[PDB]
Design a protein around this nucleic acid. Structure first.
Ligand SMILES: [Zn+2]
Ligand SMILES: [Zn+2]
Ligand SMILES: [Zn+2]
Ligand SMILES: [Zn+2]
Ligand SMILES: [Zn+2]
Length: 113
DNA sequence: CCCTGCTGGCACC
DNA sequence: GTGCCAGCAGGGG
């Protein structure tokens, strides 16, 4: 990684990667949504914007361990890691003595009180 | 450079 | 308290 950034410690082997990184410092947003004229730093981010808001018949992602539906697959990963990650020694209920080894089931029981 | 997944601020009303 | 959102960089090539 010979290409070194001038304003921070980021470095890369490709010129495209540094040109893209420089947008974080310059605040440049060269991509614009042709419907609401919203600006974005990267083109892939713009495609996700058009899909999630302006595109009809979108296929969201359903969680396998509960009934929550999520629009983005990456946000489903956050859900799985945050809500359904196993807890070796479960956390006690705030009200009663019930114990749960997954965060989602713990909150759903506390809301039942 | 397109595709992909991760990150943290922030509506939620 | 968490999904939504744009920001963001790595991988492959
Ligand atoms: Zn930099
Ligand atoms: Zn738009
Ligand atoms: Zn779930
Ligand atoms: Zn309880
Ligand atoms: Zn479980």
């Amino acid at each position: 990684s010979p290409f070194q950034c001038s304003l921070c410690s980021y470095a890369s082997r490709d010129t495209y990667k540094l040109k893209r990184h420089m947008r974080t410092h310059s605040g440049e947003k060269p991509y614009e949504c042709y419907i609401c004229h919203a600006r974005f730093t990267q083109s892939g981010t713009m495609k996700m914007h058009i899909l999630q808001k302006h595109t009809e018949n979108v296929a969201k992602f359903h969680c396998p361990h509960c009934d929550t539906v999520i629009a983005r697959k990456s946000d489903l990963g956050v859900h799985l890691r945050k809500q359904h990650s196993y807890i070796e020694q479960g956390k006690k209920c705030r009200y009663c003595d019930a114990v749960f080894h997954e965060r989602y089931a713990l909150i759903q029981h506390q809301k039942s009180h």
